[PDB]
Amino acid sequence: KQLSSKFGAISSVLNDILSRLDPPEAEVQIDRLITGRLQSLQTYVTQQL
Amino acid sequence: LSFELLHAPATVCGPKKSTNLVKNKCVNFNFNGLTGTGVLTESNKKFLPFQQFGRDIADTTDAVRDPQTLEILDITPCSFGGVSVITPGTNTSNQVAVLY
Amino acid sequence: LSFELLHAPATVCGPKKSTNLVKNKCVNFNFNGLTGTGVLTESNKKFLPFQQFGRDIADTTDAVRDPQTLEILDITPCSFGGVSVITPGTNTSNQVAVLY
Amino acid sequence: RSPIEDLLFNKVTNGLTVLPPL
Amino acid sequence: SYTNSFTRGVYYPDKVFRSSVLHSTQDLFLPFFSNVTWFHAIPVLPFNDGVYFASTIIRGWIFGTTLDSKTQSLLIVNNATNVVIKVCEFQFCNDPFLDESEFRVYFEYVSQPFLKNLREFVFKNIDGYFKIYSKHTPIDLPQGFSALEPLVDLPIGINITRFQTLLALHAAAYYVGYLQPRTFLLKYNENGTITDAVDCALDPLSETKCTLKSFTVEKGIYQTSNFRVQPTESIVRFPNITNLCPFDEVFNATRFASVYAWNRKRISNCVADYSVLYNFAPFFAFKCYGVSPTKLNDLCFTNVYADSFVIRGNEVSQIAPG
Ligand SMILES: *[C@@H]1O[C@H](CO)[C@@H](O[C@@H]2O[C@H](CO)[C@@H](O)[C@H](O)[C@H]2NC(C)=O)[C@H](O)[C@H]1NC(C)=O
Ligand SMILES: *[C@@H]1O[C@H](CO)[C@@H](O)[C@H](O)[C@H]1NC(C)=O
Ligand SMILES: *[C@@H]1O[C@H](CO)[C@@H](O)[C@H](O)[C@H]1NC(C)=O
Ligand SMILES: *[C@@H]1O[C@H](CO)[C@@H](O)[C@H](O)[C@H]1NC(C)=O
Ligand SMILES: *[C@@H]1O[C@H](CO)[C@@H](O)[C@H](O)[C@H]1NC(C)=O
Ligand SMILES: *[C@@H]1O[C@H](CO)[C@@H](O)[C@H](O)[C@H]1NC(C)=O
Helix, strand or coil: CCCCCCCCCCCCCCCCHHHHCCCCCCHHHHHHHHHHHHHHHHHHHHHHC | CEEECCCCCCCEECCCCCCCCCCCCEEEEEECCEEEEEEEEECCCCCCCCCCCECCCCCCCCEEECCCCCCEEEEECCCCCEEEEECCCCCCCCCCEEEC | CCCCCCCCCCCCCCCCCCCCCCCCCEEEEEECCEEEEEEEEECCCCCCCCCCEECCCCCCCCEEECCCCCCEEEEECCCCCCCEEECCCCCCCCCCEEEC | CCHHHHHHHHHCCCCCCCCCCC | CEEECCCCCCECCCCEECCCCCEEEEEEECCCCCEEEEECCCCCEECCCCEEEEECCCCCEEEECCCCCCCCEEEEEECCCCEEEEEECCCCCCCCEECCCCEECCCEEEECCCCCEEEEEEEEEECCEEEEEEEEEECCCCCCCCCECEEEEECCCCCCCEEEECCCCCCCCEEEEECEEEEEEEECCCCCCCCEEEECCCCHHHHHHHCCCCCCCCCCCCEEEECCCCCCCEEEECCCCCCCCCHHHHHCCCCCCCCCCCCEEEECCCCCCCCHHHCCCCCCCCCCCCCCCCCCCCCEEEEEEEECCCCCCCCCCCCCCC
16 A cells, blocks of 8 residues: 555656656656655565564 | 646547557556556456546556547556576586476 | 867866875875775785775775885774773762773 | 364465465 | 687776675676677678677777768777877778788877787777777687786777778688676686676576575575566557647737736647647747656646746746746
8 A cells, every 4th residue: 555655756656757757857756766665665574574 | 838647538648549459468558648567358347437447455557448449458467476496506416497 | 278178088187296105094095086094004915907996895995006106005994993981880989990 | 174173264264475385 | 600609708897806705797798608790701890889809810990980081980000019099080991901011991099019829809988988808818719717808998988889890911700799788796816816707697597696696506495586578569549539739829829918817728638749839949948847848749648728928038947836
C-alpha cells in the first residue's frame, strides 16, 4: 500500500514520469522517490528482522 | 496552457495512429495515456458500463477499456523473480545448474 | 590576447607554486587535487610507472607518488580517538585520572 | 496424517517473492 | 574471417594501486568469448564506443569523423624513430598507404617509438580525452592472461565516428574488435599487477563468483540476479477522434482580452497536433514545469484551458509557480 504513494512527488506511478517529464528535470523527484522507498524498505526489513 | 492528470477519459493528445490488438505476449501498452508493462488477455471481469478503468489491492492497473471498441482486457505481469544457481566447490569440477 | 571558452578541453593553465616536503607530522596535502591530512612517511613498496596514488579495501588514500620527484610516500592519519576518565565519585574524593 | 492435525490444518488458514519452506 | 576472442581486452580502469584486492569496475570493456573480425581485404570500418586493435611490421592509423577538410581528424605516424600526433582538417584518400622513400598518405606532439612479439591496441575516446593503451607481449591468438598497459593521454576533445588503418611498405592481416559497457572483476597482485580477471555477464558460475568477490566458491545456493523476459513490440491504442483542435483559431487571432479581464477557452473532444505551434517566430518560452516540452504527443490528458493576455517583457519568467 505504501509503495503506491507519491511520497510528496508529482506522480505516484513508477514509470509515468519517464515520459511526462524531462529526464534532466526528473532527477530530484526520482531521488526523493527512491530514498522514500529505501526508508520504507529499511524499516520493513528491520521490523521483519 | 493548463493541464491536469485527473481521473477522466482522455480527449486531446497526439495524432499518432493506433495498431492492431495483440494477445498472449507481455509488452508495453499505451492505453489512453496509461503506461504499463504486462500481457493482454481476455478478461472475465464484467461490470456495469459506467467506469473507465479499475484498480486492485496493489493500486495497479488490472482492468482496461479501450474506447475504440468497448471490451474488457486483463492485465498481469509476465515472468519475474530472482534466479539462483547450483554448483559444487570450484576445486573439484565446474558442472553448474540453473534454478528458477 | 583573446580568451575562448566552451570550445576545447583545458590546454594551458597558470602557475602552481608548490612547496617542500615534510615528514613525520600530519598536515594537509595537495597531491594532484587530493585533499586530506595524514603523516607522510617513506614507504617500501614499488609502483609501476603510471600510477599516482593507491588505495586499499577501505578505499582511502594511503600511498601516493610525489610529482616533484620519484620517491613513493605513505599516507597514515596521526593520533586520534576518544578520551576516557577514571574517577571514584564526588562523594569520596576529587582526584581524576585522564585516560587516552 | 492423524485426524488431530488434519482438524488443526483445516482450522488454521507483484515484485515480491515468497520462497517455499525447505 | 571470424576468430573468437579468448582473453584479450582488459586494461587498467585508472592509475590506481591495489595490493591483491578483488575489485569490481564497470567501464567500457571488451566482452569475453565474443568473436572479433580477422580482416584480409584490400575499405570503410565503423567505430563503436571503444575499439580493439591487434596486428602482427605494419604501422599507421586513420581516425576522424568524415575524413575530409570540413571537420577535425587524427593522423598518427610512427615509422622508425618518432611518433607524431596531429589534429587538423585534411582530405584523405580511399585507400592510402606508404612507400621510407615516398609517402602517398595524401597541434603536433613528438614522443618515443612504440617499438615473437604480439602487438595489440585499445583506443577509447570519451569525455574529450583520447586514451591510448598498448603492450608488447611475446609468444593465431595466443592463450594466457595478460593485462594491457596504458600509454599517454591526449585531450583531443572531438568526436570519432569512423576509423581506418594504414599499410607499411618498403594486403596484410589485422584484427579489429569492439567494446561494450559491462562489469569486470579484477584481481591485483602484491606488486600491483593484474593477474586475473573475469566477466559476470555470460556464465551463471561467473555471475555467482561476481557477487561473491572471489573466484573460489563453496557449496550452497547463491542469489545473484533476477529472471525476466523482455517485451517484444509496443502497442498503442488511441481514441478514434478526428476533429482538428482549434489551436489556430485561438492563436492566430487579431485581438486578445485584457490582463485583468482575461477570458477562458476550453479545448476538448478533438485531436491535438502539437507540431503547428512553431510557425509563430522564435519564442521566449517553452520552459515547462511538470511537463516535457520535447515530448508533447506521446502522453495523453484532458481538460485543457487556455487564456490570452499580454506581458511587459521584464517579467516573462514571472509567470511561474512559486
Ligand atoms: C624536477 O626537478 C627536480 C630538481 O631537483 C628534479 O630532481 C633531480 O632529478 C635528477 C634526475 O636524476 C637528480 O639527478 C637530481 O639529484 C634531482 N635533484 C635533487 C635536488 O635531488 C626532478 O627529477 C624533476 N622532475 C621531473 C619530472 O622532471
Ligand atoms: C579443494 O580445494 C583445496 C584447496 O583449498 C584442495 O587442496 C583440494 O585438493 C580440493 N579438493 C578436491 C580437488 O577434491
Ligand atoms: C560472430 O559470428 C556471427 C555468426 O557467425 C556473425 O554474425 C558475427 O558478425 C560475428 N561477429 C564478428 C565481430 O565478426
Ligand atoms: C561531435 O562531438 C560532440 C561533442 O560534444 C557531440 O555532441 C556530437 O554528437 C558529435 N557529432 C556526431 C555527429 O556524433
Ligand atoms: C615483486 O617484487 C619482489 C621484490 O621484493 C620480487 O622479488 C618479486 O619477484 C616481484 N613479483 C612479481 C610478480 O613481479
Ligand atoms: C473509430 O473506429 C472504430 C472502428 O471499429 C469505430 O468502432 C468507432 O466508432 C470510430 N469512432 C467514431 C467516433 O466513430
